[PDB]
Amino acid sequence: QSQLKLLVTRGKEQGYLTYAEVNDHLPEDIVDSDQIEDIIQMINDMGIQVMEEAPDADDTDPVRMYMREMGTVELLTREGEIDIAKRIEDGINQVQCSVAEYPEAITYLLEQYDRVEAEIDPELAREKFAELRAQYVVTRDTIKAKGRSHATAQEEILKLSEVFKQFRLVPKQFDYLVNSMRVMMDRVRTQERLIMKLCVEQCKMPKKNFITLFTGNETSDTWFNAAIAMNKPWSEKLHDVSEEVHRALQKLQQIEEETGLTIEQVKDINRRMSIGEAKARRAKKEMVEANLRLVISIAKKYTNRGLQFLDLIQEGNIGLMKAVDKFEYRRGYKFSTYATWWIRQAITRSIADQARTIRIPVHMIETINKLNRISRQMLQEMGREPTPEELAERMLMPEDKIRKVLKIAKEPISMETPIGDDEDSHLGDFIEDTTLELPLDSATTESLRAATHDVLAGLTAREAKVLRMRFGIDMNTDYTLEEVGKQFDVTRERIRQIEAKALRKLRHPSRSEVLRS
Amino acid sequence: RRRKLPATIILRALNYTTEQILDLFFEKVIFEIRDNKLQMELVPERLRGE
């Protein structure tokens, strides 16, 4: 109503397009560089109808909208933080324990250790890895012996799990193992989803029967042949897929032999692993979300140094994101300061490099700042400007080093900079081209080709070819006295003789003489 | 040189109530209600062009 009626009735047509009028008669936060173009566009060009397109289209900022979602405080106390960190450690532990349940994780680590020894105390490595290998070989024998029907035998298995939990593995190792287990489970559900896709859809076996039947062994053909011998309408179609299901079962049995585990529980342990992953990941996400304030508050001090506010706080977020990863609640030191250092390091190690167009190493950045911080005193503790010789004298570096250092400073300047302020000047418009050659120069070069091509005409074959082949012209690759002397029987001195005689011939013609200059 | 605002907003910003604002630009006119009727403080000069 207000905006539409005022705009239309007033603009009829405001004669000289009185822009400075209605922009004051508009609500919301003013002095913007966004709402501007939406008014200069409508008024003219497509008049009349455009003024009817404007209302129907009317019927903002990164940082300000960033603070909006961050506005969701959800701050924590010492109790809160410890609680979250406790859930983190809880999730992580359940994951590692789930890794311990996996016997192929132990035997692989064993195999890789033998690799390590086949080429941090070396004896301490031999010590613990032996302890693991010992508990493994004793636990392994109590499997097929079946003594203590997986009751006390299970005790040795879980004790072996504890022994494995003693090892402090490297981030790349744990990720490789867990990834390998999920890839293993991928192949598992690959076979299960294959058997299901083949029997349920292609053979018209209802999902009810498939879940009632397959869920049993999932490996032996006892369920499959019982499904075929069930004499149902969907059992006759199974004959057309017998080889496929057989192949899937044989491959799944193969996996049983690879893991050495009951197929009816691999899902369970892998499940609990996924459970722990979600828990630990979740808690860590809440952590970084909660201490989000700290990022901006400290990043504010590093602002304006070749990188904008958003980029800084983003590097501070990943700095906080790394901090949360390396921290435990069982630690007297609080998170408020520990995270702060990681954030400072995160953004400062970003402003160092990804700031100026040209590359630069960290030591360069530090030396440069040190030079400035020292220079600001020399002119204030004396009275005159800081001479480069004396300024260098106050430093470990000689002087020429500092001179080259100042040749790396600044972005530097951009081409689009106005200079003479003509109509309109630009620095990059004065920049000449030197890689190109003068049309005169190109013309002379062609005339030079013609000159030489015509000069070697007034020579003999066993002399034209000699001069041509030696100085390598009109044949790309140039040859030497030997490679030419071999192709002309007589070697070295004889060919150099002719080579010098050709030069003797060119002591009268004026063509190449003037071409010289 | 920004968007327009009623020039009385700055007055309120100077801690001026609405009543004080009115008593800084205009001349008041008092009416009395006595003997069940309405009287008025008449000023002859003010009745110019009415």
From Swiss-Prot, chain A:
PROSITE patterns: SIGMA70_1 (PS00715), SIGMA70_2 (PS00716). The record marks 470 as: Interaction with anti-sigma factors. A motif (Interaction with polymerase core subunit RpoC) lies at residues 311-314. It comes from the Bacteria. InterPro entries: RNA_pol_sigma-70_dom, RNA_pol_sigma70, RNA_pol_sigma70_r1_2, RNA_pol_sigma70_r2, RNA_pol_sigma70_r3, RNA_pol_sigma70_r4, RNA_pol_sigma_70_non-ess, RNA_pol_sigma_70_r1_1. Residues 481-500 bind DNA. GO terms for molecular function: DNA binding; sigma factor activity. Residues 287-357 are annotated as: Sigma-70 factor domain-2. Residues 455-508 are annotated as: Sigma-70 factor domain-4. Keywords: Cytoplasm, DNA-binding, Sigma factor, Transcription, Transcription regulation. It is found in: Cytoplasm. This is RNA polymerase sigma factor RpoD. It comes from Escherichia coli (strain K12). The lineage of its organism: Bacteria, Pseudomonadati, Pseudomonadota, Gammaproteobacteria, Enterobacterales. The gene is rpoD.
Swiss-Prot record, chain B:
Co-administration of salinamide and rifampicin or salinamide and myxopyronin suppresses the emergence of resistance to both antibiotics. It comes from the Bacteria. Acetylated on several lysine residues in the presence of glucose. The RNAP catalytic core consists of 2 alpha, 1 beta, 1 beta' and 1 omega subunit. When a sigma factor is associated with the core the holoenzyme is formed, which can initiate transcription. The rRNA transcription and antitermination complex (rrnTAC) consists of RNAP, NusA, NusB, NusE (rpsJ), NusG, SubB, ribosomal protein S4, DNA and precursor rRNA; S4 is more flexible than other subunits. In pull-down experiments interacts with CedA. (Microbial infection) Interacts (via flap domain) with Escherichia phage lambda antitermination protein Q; this interaction renders bacterial RNAP resistant to transcription pausing and allows it to read through termination signals. DNA-dependent RNA polymerase (RNAP) catalyzes the transcription of DNA into RNA using the four ribonucleoside triphosphates as substrates. Resistance to the antibiotics salinamide A, salinamide B, rifampicin, streptolydigin, CBR703, myxopyronin, and lipiarmycin can result from mutations in this protein. Belongs to the RNA polymerase beta chain family. This is DNA-directed RNA polymerase subunit beta. The gene is rpoB. The chain holds residues 200 to 249 of 1342 of the full protein.
